[PDB]
Amino acid sequence: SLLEKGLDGAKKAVGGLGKLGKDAVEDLESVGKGAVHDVKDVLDSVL
Amino acid sequence: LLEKGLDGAKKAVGGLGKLGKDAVEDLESVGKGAVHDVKDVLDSVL
Amino acid sequence: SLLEKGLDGAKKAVGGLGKLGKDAVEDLESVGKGAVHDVKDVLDSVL
Amino acid sequence: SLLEKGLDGAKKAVGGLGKLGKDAVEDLESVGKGAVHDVKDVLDSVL
Amino acid sequence: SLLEKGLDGAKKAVGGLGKLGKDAVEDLESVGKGAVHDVKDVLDSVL
Amino acid sequence: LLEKGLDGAKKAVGGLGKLGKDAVEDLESVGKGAVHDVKDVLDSVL
Ligand SMILES: [Zn+2]
Ligand SMILES: [Zn+2]
Ligand SMILES: [Zn+2]
Ligand SMILES: [Zn+2]
Ligand SMILES: [Zn+2]
Ligand SMILES: [Zn+2]
Ligand SMILES: [Zn+2]
Ligand SMILES: [Zn+2]
Ligand SMILES: [Zn+2]
Ligand SMILES: [Zn+2]
Ligand SMILES: [Zn+2]
Ligand SMILES: [Zn+2]
């Protein structure tokens, strides 16, 4: 039925977005934690 | 005092990342439950 | 259907606990790892 | 440096347990969820 | 030093591959578990 | 017997997915420990 295959297509999309999401959010954590490491690096040519 | 502040921002970031992936996970789980719960209803209707 | 809804009540309940156990852990490993880095700082402060 | 290596011994040890606790959980939620689906099958078999 | 920034670039790459990895592997789980759901769907126009 | 077999393959898949993300995680953690452990050594050398 177009229906079950409708809902599975919503389900499939719900999961798609949910990886884009979790991948943006993790790409973010790493930027944040990258930034801070790379700053600290600078506070070491200066130690 | 500086080091201690980098490790503040690094703990802020992680927490913020922890808070964020726990939103994504609760939103996909909503969605999927909707679709499930719509299955169940279009089902008493088979 | 009471019974289909009971069960999904169960499915959902597991998923909480499951995801709720997954924070607990994550929080433990960032604690263990927090103290470590934090001791690396003290011992470094006596470089 | 014994002490730097001690600590990393610790860091690594946490990471095991952490990641080792994360399987335990994952295994619990697929168990709970296993039984559920599996009961949905029985109750369906009396459709 | 080119060195610390060397190693961070390895570190950055180690993590990059480690997302490609974990994303292939999950894209796989879903295909596998997609396939099986969509098969079962077919065994229902036939129930 | 069929249903029971789909739920066999579905449990096979998950396990295989569980086994696989636990390789990726142990390989990135190797790598990163190498880089860390190379830091530590190029460090007694500051
Ligand atoms: Zn990306
Ligand atoms: Zn660095
Ligand atoms: Zn620190
Ligand atoms: Zn929540
Ligand atoms: Zn249901
Ligand atoms: Zn918490
Ligand atoms: Zn070390
Ligand atoms: Zn296991
Ligand atoms: Zn992809
Ligand atoms: Zn379907
Ligand atoms: Zn089944
Ligand atoms: Zn392992």
DSSP per position, F1-46: --HHHHHHHHHHHHHHHHHHHHHHHHHHHHHHHHHHHHHHHHHTT-
CA distance to partner chain D, nearest, from residue F29 (Å): 9
User: What architecture is domain C4-40?
Assistant: Up-down Bundle (1.20)
- Please work out, in degrees rounded to the nearest 5, the angle formed at the alpha carbon of residue F14 by the alpha carbons of F9 and F15: 95
Q: Are D25 and F2 in contact (CB under 8 A)?
A: no
Q: With an 8 Å Cβ cutoff, are F29 and D15 in contact? A: yes
* Contact yes or no for C15 and B29 at CB 8 A: yes
Output the CA torsion sign for A11, C7, B21, F7. Answer: negative
The annotation status of A41 as a binding-site residue, yes or no, is: yes
Question: F21 CA distance to ligand 10 centroid (A)?
Answer: 26
Gyration radius from chain F CA atoms = 20
Measure the CA–CA gap between D33 and A18, rounded to whole angstroms: 20
Strand, coil or helix: E41: helix
Experimental method: X-ray
CATH number of F3-39: 1.20.5.700
Q: Residues, chain E, total?
A: 47
Subunit contact C32:D18, Cβ cutoff 8 A: yes
The alpha carbon of B11 and the centre of ligand 7 are apart by a number of angstroms equal to 20
Q: Least CA distance to F30: which residue of chain D? A: D12
